[PDB]
Amino acid sequence: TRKVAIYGKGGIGKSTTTQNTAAALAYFHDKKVFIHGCDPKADSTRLILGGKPQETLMDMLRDKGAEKITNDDVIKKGFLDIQCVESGGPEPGVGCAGRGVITAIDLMEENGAYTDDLDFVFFDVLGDVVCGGFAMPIRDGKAQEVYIVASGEMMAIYAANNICKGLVKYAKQSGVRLGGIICNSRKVDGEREFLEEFTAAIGTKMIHFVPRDNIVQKAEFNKKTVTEFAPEENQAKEYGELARKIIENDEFVIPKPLTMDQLEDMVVKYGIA
Amino acid sequence: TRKVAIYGKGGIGKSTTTQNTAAALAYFHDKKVFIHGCDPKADSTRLILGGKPQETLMDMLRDKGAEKITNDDVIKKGFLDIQCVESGGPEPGVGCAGRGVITAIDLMEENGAYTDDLDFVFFDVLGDVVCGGFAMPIRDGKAQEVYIVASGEMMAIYAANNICKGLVKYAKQSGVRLGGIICNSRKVDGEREFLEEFTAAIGTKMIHFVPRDNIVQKAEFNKKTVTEFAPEENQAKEYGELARKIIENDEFVIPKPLTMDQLEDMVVKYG
Ligand SMILES: Nc1ncnc2c1ncn2[C@@H]1O[C@H](COP(=O)(O)OP(=O)(O)O)[C@@H](O)[C@H]1O
Ligand SMILES: Nc1ncnc2c1ncn2[C@@H]1O[C@H](COP(=O)(O)OP(=O)(O)O)[C@@H](O)[C@H]1O
Numbered sequence A: 001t002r003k004v005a006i007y008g009k010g011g012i013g014k015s016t017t018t019q020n021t022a023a024a025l026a027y028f029h030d031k032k033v034f035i036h037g038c039d040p041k042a043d044s045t046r047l048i049l050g051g052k053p054q055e056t057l058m059d060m061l062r063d064k065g066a067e068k069i070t071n072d073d074v075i076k077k078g079f080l081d082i083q084c085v086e087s088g089g090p091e092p093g094v095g096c097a098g099r100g101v102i103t104a105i106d107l108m109e110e111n112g113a114y115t116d117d118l119d120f121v122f123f124d125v126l127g128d129v130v131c132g133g134f135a136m137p138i139r140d141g142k143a144q145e146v147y148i149v150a151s152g153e154m155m156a157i158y159a160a161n162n163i164c165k166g167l168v169k170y171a172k173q174s175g176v177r178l179g180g181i182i183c184n185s186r187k188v189d190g191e192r193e194f195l196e197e198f199t200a201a202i203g204t205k206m207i208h209f210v211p212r213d214n215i216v217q218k219a220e221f222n223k224k225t226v227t228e229f230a231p232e233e234n235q236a237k238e239y240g241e242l243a244r245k246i247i248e249n250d251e252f253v254i255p256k257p258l259t260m261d262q263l264e265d266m267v268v269k270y271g272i273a
Numbered sequence B: 001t002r003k004v005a006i007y008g009k010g011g012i013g014k015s016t017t018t019q020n021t022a023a024a025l026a027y028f029h030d031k032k033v034f035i036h037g038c039d040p041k042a043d044s045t046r047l048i049l050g051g052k053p054q055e056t057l058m059d060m061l062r063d064k065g066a067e068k069i070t071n072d073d074v075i076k077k078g079f080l081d082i083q084c085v086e087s088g089g090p091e092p093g094v095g096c097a098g099r100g101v102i103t104a105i106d107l108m109e110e111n112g113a114y115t116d117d118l119d120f121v122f123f124d125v126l127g128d129v130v131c132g133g134f135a136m137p138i139r140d141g142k143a144q145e146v147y148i149v150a151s152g153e154m155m156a157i158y159a160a161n162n163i164c165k166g167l168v169k170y171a172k173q174s175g176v177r178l179g180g181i182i183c184n185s186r187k188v189d190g191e192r193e194f195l196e197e198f199t200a201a202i203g204t205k206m207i208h209f210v211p212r213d214n215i216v217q218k219a220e221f222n223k224k225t226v227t228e229f230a231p232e233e234n235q236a237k238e239y240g241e242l243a244r245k246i247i248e249n250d251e252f253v254i255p256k257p258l259t260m261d262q263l264e265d266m267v268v269k270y271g
């Protein structure tokens, strides 16, 4: 089973990319996929489960209690029987925002939920801080491969670079490696050239350019991924291609993070605003 | 002294808004201002100071040690003697990203850095999570009043709403209140209407609309806030007006955060 962690800044397209890739892997490549939501926003599985928001493991522990919760309560099946979990986490202000990810991954390991017949487990992880439960997939090697979603914006590549510092720290301990940067386009000029240079500099590749396409919001309105909603659309084919390149990827690196000065110089070099 | 925490999503304009407001309070309103950076990005003070970040308290503790650090090492004076500190934070992957904020605020309280003659202390706080040292200014009441920077974008309003849940939690314990949402415009149609509706619904106000203006990047290139670079520019006068509304603000609320469904429905309404 390939254990894959998807990191990136808030709003960059982690859950859009993960869900669409998961649906494309199942539909176009006949793969068994599990999605484990590790983002307090807790909408990482909504489009696979056709719009019904799933109860988080933390909310169930809170209401029904530890020794009365079964795999069937926490794991729901959606499009093509893709298995879905939401870690959840405590209320803003209360304790560590990542604590639910620890409890959730611990329980899935305890209960053998990550079965040997899975082709892929995706952890959709909040990446604005790399600490607590948000770091666990990298620190404890729950995922062996990382892809970072970014775009042509300073804060997106700053977040990417920061996540890469996490990977450097835990590379020898955990065996975790960077598989690539996914460009989730924000439709800005220089974006592709910028990320080609960024990825070369940190020692990886931009594995795929995902276009910004209105079909994503049309599919969201119909409570679906693009592959489920309209598998003949170009955007479905883009996720099918991203899915292919992830299946076939053999380039896993310890990245070489940049200084703040190098990030700022590379932004002005490609006229990213 | 008014103790003010500025929260918001990464990249929303917390440090641009804080530094320009601080410069406008000093220049237009003759105020003594202290800025305490509580964001690991650690560039919260670059435009008040000469440029290229100041050393963080955490990096100095790491290299020279506590008990060999003086106030003068951590607090730098910039435009109109605005005093500046960067908390810093551990390396990504190493411990809690907020732990430096706690150490830094504790040390400034220890060493009496927040002198009674200060009109304003601004905490520039990472708002993508509200936990550990990022929650401390609200949980332990180091700031009494909060402004949230947002824009038309879904994740900016999601972050605002989530920060409001933090404020609700600590409202009775700490006496923390929300003073308003600052719209730092991303130059999109519907933005003003979106934030008017969002702020009414959660029981606050959009205190000020900060236009997207190229003068900010011209001033950054000159290593300056807009007030320092060009105080006669409209954008300098906008920060002077935001500064005025903060000085005169008497509307401090416990907000009523939206549910997931309410927030999602209102985001698709103003897409
Ligand atoms: N490639 C894309 N084209 C169109 N809309 C997109 C695309 N990627 C993301 N979106 C939109 O961007 C927003 C944020 O994406 P999301 O996947 O939730 O981000 P994250 O999980 O990183 O916070 C959503 O409104 C989603 O529809
Ligand atoms: N009102 C504005 N007009 C133009 N550019 C702005 C404005 N506010 C912020 N910016 C730009 O947006 C970027 C991010 O702002 P910043 O203050 O660093 O965000 P944060 O502190 O929330 O991470 C900077 O490059 C800054 O120049």
Ligand code: SF4
Pocket (backbone or CB within 6 Å): A095, A096, A097, A098, A099, A129, A130, A131, A132, A133, A134, B095, B096, B097, B098, B129, B130, B131, B132, B133, B134
């Ligand atoms: S470890 Fe990270 S997520 Fe947890 S309290 Fe600290 S900043 Fe928040």
Ligand SMILES: [Mg+2]
Pocket (backbone or CB within 6 Å): A014, A015, A016, A039, A041, A043, A044, A124
């Ligand atoms: Mg998400």
Ligand SMILES: [Mg+2]
Pocket (backbone or CB within 6 Å): B014, B015, B016, B039, B041, B043, B044, B124
């Ligand atoms: Mg900042």
